[PDB]
């Protein structure tokens, strides 16, 4: 009963969260997960500021209202060479990664490790935050509030 949450640097308080290293988060689980990080889904404006601070990924993830990939550098295999906040227009499917926004974060690039999920609740799941440098923080708990997600 174990969940890995892969997280990134924060950029103006925005970071990327990838569940179990695969597209596997629904829109409702996304909201709950950001809540567990005392965070919210970013707005498009918040994402655009993050991007300007140096944030890019090669993964689809939820923000408030859309599924996007922030791109700085054009790369053929990431959002088809687009730069800027690329918006997913057409897809059959509903599960992606998520982005989260933490207002308490530093204003620009913060590439320190994440070492807590301060707002997770009581539960049976071993939840592991995995940083990009491999550093890990684990705790027993739960964050999903929708039965359909469990
Ligand atoms: C950069 C990213 C999301 C890419 N997929 C693997 C992984 C693992 C730990 C932290 C971050 C990542």
Curated annotation (Swiss-Prot):
Disulfide bonds join 9-111, 34-100, 58-78. Glycans are attached at residues 6, 38, 81, 92, 102. Expressed in the intestinal epithelium. It is found in: Cell membrane; Cell projection, Microvillus; Secreted. The lectin-like LINK domain is responsible for hyaluronan binding. Interacts with PKN2. Interacts with TIAM1 and TIAM2. Interacts with HA, as well as other glycosaminoglycans, collagen, laminin, and fibronectin via its N-terminal segment. Interacts with UNC119. Interacts with PDPN (via extracellular domain); this interaction is required for PDPN-mediated directional migration and regulation of lamellipodia extension/stabilization during cell spreading and migration. Interacts with RDX, EZR and MSN (via FERM domain). Interacts with EGFR. Interacts with CD74; this complex is essential for the MIF-induced signaling cascade that results in B cell survival. This is CD44 antigen.
């Amino acid at each position: 009963n174990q969940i890995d949450l892969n997280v990134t640097c924060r950029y103006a308080g925005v970071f990327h969260v990838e569940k179990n290293g695969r597209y596997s988060i629904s829109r409702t689980e996304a909201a709950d997960l950001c809540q567990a990080f005392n965070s919210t889904l970013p707005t498009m404006d918040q994402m655009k500021l993050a991007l300007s601070k140096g944030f890019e990924t090669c993964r689809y993830g939820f923000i408030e209202g859309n599924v996007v990939i922030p791109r700085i550098h054009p790369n053929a295999i990431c959002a088809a060479n687009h730069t800027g906040v690329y918006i997913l227009v057409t897809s059959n499917t509903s599960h992606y990664d998520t982005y989260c926004f933490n207002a308490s974060a530093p204003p620009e690039e913060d590439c320190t490790s994440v070492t807590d999920l301060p707002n997770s609740f009581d539960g049976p799941v071993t939840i592991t935050i995995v940083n990009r440098d491999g550093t890990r923080y684990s705790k027993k708990g739960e964050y999903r509030t929708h039965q359909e997600d469990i």
